[PDB]
Every structure is written in C-alpha cells, then in structure tokens.
Amino acid sequence: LLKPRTLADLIRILHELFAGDEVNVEEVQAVLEAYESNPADWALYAKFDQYRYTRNLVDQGNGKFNLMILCWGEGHGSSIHDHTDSHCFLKLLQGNLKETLFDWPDKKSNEMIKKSERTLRENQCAYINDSIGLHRVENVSHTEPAVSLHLYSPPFDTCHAFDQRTGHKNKVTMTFHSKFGIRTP
Template sequence: MSGDYKLNPETLQELIESLHVLFSTDKVNVEEVQSVMENYKSDEDDWDKFAKYDHHRYTRNLVDEGNGRFNLMILAWGEGQGSSIHSHSDAHCFMKVLDGTLRESLFSWPSESEKRRAMNQIGVNDYQRDQVAYINDSKGLHRVENLSHSDSACSLHLYSPPFDSCKCFDQRTGKCATSKVTFWSKYGERTPFKPGGGCQSAVVEFEQPENN
C-alpha cells in the first residue's frame, strides 16, 4: 500500500483522505476499509449538508468520487422508507449507519430455471449508529429499510467500483428488472438526473478474509 492513512479518522474529510490512500493501489483489503469506516465516529456537523431528504423516497447523495475507484455517498432515509431488493453490479458495498437504525434483509439469488417463485430470505440484521455492514453479489441480495415511523435515518455508503445500474427484484415472484441509479444531489447541491450519463471506473482487486 502506498502512503499513510489515519486508522482512526476524526472527521468525514479525514475518512475520505484515508479511503483515497486505501484505494490508491489495485488491491484493497475489505477488512481495512471496514475498520477505518467503523473507527470514524458519526458527527452531524460533518455530514448534515449532504443529507437531503425527500418525502416520497430515500435519496442518494454523492460525497466523493474516489478518483474513479469508488463512490462515497450518503443515503437519507425518511420515516418508513426503504429500498427494493437489489444487487450491486459486481461491486463491493460498505454501509455505515450515521444516524438512526437500519434493517438489512438478505436474500439468495432467485433460480434462473424457475420462472415465478417467492424469494428466499436468508437473514436479517439491524444496524445502529456507527456500525458497518458489507455485502457483494457473491453473498446474495439485500434490501435496506428504515422501519421507524417517527425518526429518519442516515447512512454512508461506499461502492467499488462505481456503478450506474443494478438489478431489482420482486420478493413475491423473483422477477428481475434493471434499474438506473442516480444521485439526488452531488457535493451538497441538488443535481437533476441527465440521461446518458454513465460512470467510468477503475478495476480494483479486493483481498477478502479467508473465512468470508
């Protein structure tokens, strides 16, 4: 690994700088990334300007583009809002809860040989403030939800490599559709979706723990 990074970043900016160091080579260690993200303690003064809420759906708000190797974004979840069941387009996904509680429901991939069947749920995890979750497509699919009807929630997500579409699934039938993913805002400013805008990314090889 080239360069030094702060194992215990005190601010969001220090976390971003540490992530740039961790992603400065073609090989990245999953446990190192997860550890640095866990060690940053959430501070609303750091991330509040990026947390843009919408009454109708959760929002994806770009914080940093990671020199093409990753996207770092904040997802703002209003009361009762959640995602569909979705894949991650062969990317690595880290999710850190900044505020509130989020539930992750895990599902196995539907069988390609069966046309219509309810999806198999394989796990449920509840994540509190400062906890970090990790998933990739080899582990399965997931849905993330803010189950609270009185409190909003906020989370920090890192995707490597970046992607601009993923597969979404109907839990009742397993039916799959490709969905475009867009940013509600970039760097704290509202950014309307512009058709035709893809994301270019570098290829990064991840080192996985042997027991994963």
C-alpha cells in the same frame, strides 16, 4: 491505519486505501466503523425527500469508488437489489436500518425467501457483494429518519431490482439527488 477524526480525514484515508488495484475489505470496514458520526461533518449532504430515500454523492474516489450519503425518511426502504459485481460498504450515521438478505433466485418463478435479517445501528458498518447475496435495506421507524454512508467500488450507475414473488429482475438506473452538496434535478 489511523482513526478518522472527521469525515474529511476518513475520505483522505479511503483515498490511501484505494491507491492500489485491489481492495482490503476488512481494513476499509474497520476505518469506516472507526469514524464517529458527527452530524456537523455531513449536514451538507443529508438532503431528504418526502417520498423516498435520496442518494447524495460526497466523493468520487479518483474514479475508484463512489462515497455517498443515503437519507431515509420514516418507512423509506429499498427494493431487493444486487450490487453490479462491486464491493458495497454501509455505515450508519444516524438512526437504524433493517437489512434483509436474500439468495440469488432460481430461474424458477418462485417467492424469494429471506436468509436473514438484522438491525444495523448507529456507527456500525455492514459489507455486502453479489457472492454473499441480495439484500433489502429499510428504515422501519415511524419516528426517526436514518442516514447512512455508502461506498461502492467499482462505481456503478445501475443495478437490478428483484420482485419478491417471482425472483424476476429488472435493471434500474441510480439517480443522485445531489452532488457535492448541490441538488441536481
């Protein structure tokens, strides 16, 4: 377990950690957090959109994980979502994001109430899965875009969004804005 000097070193260390069948969550998280964000490494991937956050595939981890870069303009946020029974790691490359944690609702139609909120700041790494709960991620800054590195294992194409007033959920299909530095409409 060595320090990733560059995003390309990190990706090679991640391939080594996902060699087996099972995941060492704490080791993944330590090494993601040890990579010092350098914009020259991931410039190619930071493709923003005026209206919402963009998802930009970086590496597909020999089928074991998706590594992607999320770009969040001012005020861009996600909905309340689960992660499809996968692991989710989230490292901040630039700016800050607010994360809000929710519990799985009851089949009762009811407002969903926050368990907790917190700020994720530059270079920190957060971890979530469905057994911890639901969450919402947002760039609440009026001035500064945010960029995060995201790692999901196993990969998933879809997830569920939750309406905060009802807890009712809807299945959603992930879109890539770009793959490997190349935009894809």
